[PDB]
C-alpha cells in the first residue's frame, strides 16, 4: 500500500495536469493525492488507454498523459511509480 498520510497530502497540479483533471469533471485548483488519482483514473477509463487483454497495462504513447508522465506506458500495479509521475507534474 501507500501510506494514508501521503494519500491526503495537498498538492497543486501543473497547468497541463490540471487541464486533464478538469476535463473529466474536477473543479478545484488544489487536490489531495487521492483526489488526483480518482480523476486520473476516470480519464484513463474514458479514453480506454489500458490493454484489453491485460488491463493493468496502460499505453499512453499517443496521448497527452504520455507527454505528462514522460513514459510510453506503465503498470497500474506500480503504485509508487504512479505517485512519482504525479509528483513531477506539481507546482
Amino acid at each position: 500500500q501507500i501510506p494514508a498520510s501521503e494519500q491526503e497530502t495537498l498538492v497543486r497540479p501543473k497547468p497541463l495536469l490540471l487541464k486533464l483533471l478538469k476535463s473529466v469533471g474536477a473543479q478545484k485548483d488544489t487536490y489531495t493525492m487521492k483526489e488526483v488519482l480518482f480523476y486520473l483514473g476516470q480519464y484513463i477509463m474514458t479514453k480506454r488507454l489500458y490493454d484489453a487483454a491485460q488491463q493493468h497495462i496502460v499505453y499512453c504513447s499517443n496521448d497527452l498523459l504520455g507527454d505528462l508522465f514522460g513514459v510510453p506506458s506503465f503498470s497500474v500495479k506500480e503504485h509508487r511509480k504512479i505517485y512519482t509521475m504525479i509528483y513531477r507534474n506539481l507546482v
Binding site: 500500500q1 488519482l37 480518482f38 483514473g41 484513463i44 477509463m45 488491463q55 493493468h56 497500474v76 504512479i82
Partner: peptide, 12 residues
C-alpha cells in the same frame, strides 16, 4: 482484473 478493479486499489 478489469482496469477499474486494478485502479480502485489505489483508493485503499
Amino acid at each position: 482484473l478489469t482496469f477499474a478493479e486494478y485502479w480502485a486499489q489505489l483508493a485503499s
